[PDB]
RNA sequence: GAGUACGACCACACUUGAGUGAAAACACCAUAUCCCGUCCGAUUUGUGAAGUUAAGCACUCACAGGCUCAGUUAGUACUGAGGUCAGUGAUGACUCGGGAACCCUGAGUGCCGUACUCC
RNA sequence: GGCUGGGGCGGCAUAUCUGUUACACGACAACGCAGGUGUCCUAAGGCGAGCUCAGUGGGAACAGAAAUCUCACGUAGAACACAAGCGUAAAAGCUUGCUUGAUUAACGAUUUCCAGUACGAAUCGAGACUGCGAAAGCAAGGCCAGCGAUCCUUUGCGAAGAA
RNA sequence: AUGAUUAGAGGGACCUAUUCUCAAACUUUAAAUGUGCAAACAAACCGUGCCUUAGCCAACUGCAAGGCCGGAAAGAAAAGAAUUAGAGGCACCAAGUGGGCCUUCUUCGGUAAGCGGAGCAGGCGAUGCGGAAUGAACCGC
């Protein structure tokens, strides 16, 4: 009994954290548009720190969300960086992934003697097709336990296509 | 001298010595000046026409009496 | 750690069933149902438009304590009787429903031919109100009231049917908002389905599979609804032809058997 | 009460009961109030504007003015030697039609329905008699009252 | 016997883990020219109907948590009236009367309207 | 000046607001207890829409207890200018949009304190012109402490035109 | 739940279920005594009654109001199913007082007080008389 419940990749969320606002943030905001082809929304700061060197509402990070065909081909383009090998330490209990990607140059975009080289953060959300039930405004209710994606089932899903893992 | 004393002591004995007079009946004071006005207007616009009709009955009972005898 | 602690359910207060089910917006209808207390029991109706994908529902509902009561109810799925065989959920049908509801209630209440409303549906905005027309509020529900939304299509389906529903031509499709004026043209095109009639011609397996298979020409559409409009106005009332529980002993008996079963193994 | 404010004495009178919290229900919006009708003034705490004063909570009177969102009520407030008859202005969320007058107006109906029932008989239901009048008792079981030796060790627990 | 739309009382309705769901519905769903809205057609908005009961929803289940009602706790605690009552006191019993609460046990696990529809 | 466990010194119990004393309506004293007030806000007022908060747990380049992204849980454990209480979860909180109902309001009534006087604050209205909203509706400030007689000074309304 | 708080156990801290002990400024629950109203004569109840409206509404002879005209009226049965030295109501003018004190019960500050401060009542003050040998207030009256 598995008609609709095959796993798919719902969203790939990119995150770039920068402990400062200004140029390097405005630059990285351009590093995403070149890459994920969407104008990003930039985070602000939730609180002051004084060690990290961040105050509140400083515009720390610039992140973007990616869905659909852009997301698979960009997943591949970023999953090839680490050579389709990653650590099972990196699988959420909800069935999601993460990648270091210290160099966005490794992601295929030509360098500009302005921006420089940034660290990227890819994070993937795997879910079955029935999960609108938890979002839609009217008659919103829980997804149900049987239908959630397990930490294991997301491992196999990753070992079905572009295999391999380490513990 | 400490002059700041406060007591309720003898009071409800005085308040009941002429008794606590019960309320005034509903019919006695109505005097609706509060009041929700567009209903108050439409009440006097009738209360005039009840005067004509009732003061007319005063005349029809003058004739009908002298008519009888 | 565990926040579902035994004492959590103990002090937990439940929201209303229609709130748990996510069906009704209670801060809303509580404001819609209310009325001046000087109007004592004076009947106050509201037309509720609830669009369930594959269908549309437009009802006229008096609200009272024992429960709401429905004067008349129109459905998108009753349109095929009137000649609309495809796309029952679109804006064009959303207009017909509520033109069906408006004309079916005015026959219901006996008003009948006294109030008619524009037959050309050369859609335009007019102020709502010698006799004053039948008045009903529009009840959106949880829909977002974005301009163009179908819920407000039913709105001018009723208005064009003679019911007086207070509104402003703000959320109808074809409205600038850069200039305060509504463009009746773009709004008409949306009414008779030109937005659909243009998007078939742009297609010609899955999308519009029933349109193509049933062979509707994109040119026939603005005439298909137009006949259905004048058909609704003629005949309003035409529609589509034609585990047992365990008892208190069984729950307990099955339990003492289940324990003695595993109490005999050790 | 230290400060003698407007709503100075109440963290309880104005608090909602446990797990009864919420905004006022529909059924109290769809009640309608006619002038002359008796009413309970019980302040709901989930509506800020329109509350009656701390004294009037829990009283009953005759509504007199009725305004679109308001009512008004005539309540008896005893003062030094006399009862003033007070007129207060409340938002009707705080108002509930009283059942006080009820059993009486039901005694009046069950008289008239009684009377039209005798008019041409059909007879009438029988008149219930006293329970205090006489009788022989036929006991099915009889027991002894005594103070038991055992009754004392039950009263010293432990 | 059910579904949907609106609802009244707002846990006997909730919460968790399982199981089963006739038809019609509901929904998931496919899609993004047009109206419209976002970083993302995710939410949303517009078009439609290829697929699935997997999930929501309905139902059943659990010596389940909670909640409802009744027992018990107990005529105990407390308390209105009384004494030229006991006691050094602290307090207590008594006399004419009202009279609780949790734990604990058993039993229940929604109900009631308007409108349209399915066998 | 006054109150004052003699007066003085100190204090403020002098006008005042929340909890408690306070005895399950209301009322109730002390130099009784624990704290507040003389301000602050064109947004922190008005409204519509969308959203959910404190925190916890899994996971993500640097990145750690603590940055940002993501998912799940989350009966309010947050927030609402401030003392305290009360109330609020598709909001009364948060974000955002448009705004000036923080104006005028014919001498309306009523509550609170109470002599049923005034002041302060508040509730219910009717009229004008409005705001936001598709609409029902909401708003005459930020609920409830944040304040002022006679006399005197001072400003505003009683434009022009017509009879 | 919020705030205090002792101990062992189960899976150094933690987590889970218990455990000893508490709250004027805590509370799910929640009395006794209380408190608001109602209990038939300017009222209420009944009617395919009628008149009037610049009130409500998509109705319209529905609902609001002031009436009018008819109806009935154990004048409030039965069920424990009230009682009364129950004439109700309004007004004018004016004195004295505005230092109180004692007590059952509740009660706050104080180690306590024939101390200071309140609540519901009863007394002395203003009042003797009989009784507790004597005592303002106790007991009887």
From TrEMBL, chain A:
InterPro entries: Ribosomal_uL5, Ribosomal_uL5_C, Ribosomal_uL5_CS, Ribosomal_uL5_dom_sf, Ribosomal_uL5_euk/arc-type, Ribosomal_uL5_N
Hydrolase found in the keyword field: no
Domain Large ribosomal subunit protein uL5 C-terminal: from-to ranges: 59-157
Large ribosomal subunit protein uL5 N-terminal domain segment(s): 2-55
Top-level taxon: Eukaryota
Compartments, as annotated in UniProt: Cytoplasm; Nucleus
Family annotation (NCBIfam families): PRK04219.1
Listed name of the protein: Large ribosomal subunit protein uL5
UniProtKB/TrEMBL annotation, chain C:
Pfam families: Ribosomal_L18_c (PF14204), Ribosomal_L5e (PF17144)
Single biological process term from Gene Ontology: translation
GO cellular component terms listed in the entry, alphabetical order: cytosolic large ribosomal subunit
Source domain of life: Eukaryota
Localization: Cytoplasm
Domain Large ribosomal subunit protein uL18 C-terminal eukaryotes: from-to ranges: 221-263
Any one GO MF annotation of this record: 5S rRNA binding
UniProtKB keywords: Cytoplasm, Ribonucleoprotein, Ribosomal protein
UniProt KW Cytoplasm keyword: yes
Family to which the UniProt record says this protein belongs: Belongs to the universal ribosomal protein uL18 family.
Name of the protein: 60S ribosomal protein L5, putative
Lineage, top ranks: Eukaryota, Discoba, Euglenozoa, Kinetoplastea, Metakinetoplastina
TrEMBL record, chain D:
Source organism superkingdom: Eukaryota
Keywords associated with the record: Ribonucleoprotein, Ribosomal protein
Pfam annotation, one family: Ribosomal_L21e
Gene Ontology molecular function: structural constituent of ribosome
Annotated Gene Ontology cellular component terms: ribonucleoprotein complex; ribosome
GO biological process: translation
Family: Belongs to the eukaryotic ribosomal protein eL21 family.
Protein name (record): 60S ribosomal protein L21, putative
